[PDB]
Amino acid sequence: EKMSTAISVLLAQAVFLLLTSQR
Amino acid sequence: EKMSTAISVLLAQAVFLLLTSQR
């Protein structure tokens, strides 16, 4: 579950930069 | 699972402020 929460976190920042460009 | 649902919740609000700027 450790590497599983680390992989989901990566995609998390991927969505962050998303709102950054659209915002 | 407690801290796991608390970490996902944080990102949840992160997406909320997202629709706020785009909306």
Place this chain on the structure above:
Amino acid sequence: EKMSTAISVLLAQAVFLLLTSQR
């Protein structure tokens, strides 16, 4: 897992209204 799928569902509609405003 029941309340866990009910909490994720709530955020689900939260994203729905999101595409509604942006769409």
Place this chain on the structure above:
Amino acid sequence: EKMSTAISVLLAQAVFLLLTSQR
């Protein structure tokens, strides 16, 4: 877990049509 991955898939397409309108 079967119906759990089928419920998440539904929301998946819900987000797809989202990028479709915004794109």
Place this chain on the structure above:
Amino acid sequence: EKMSTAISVLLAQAVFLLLTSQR
């Protein structure tokens, strides 16, 4: 869980191309 993280990854890229068009 292996095929489960591979199915979620697919949708991941699905959201990526999303910010690409909107950005």
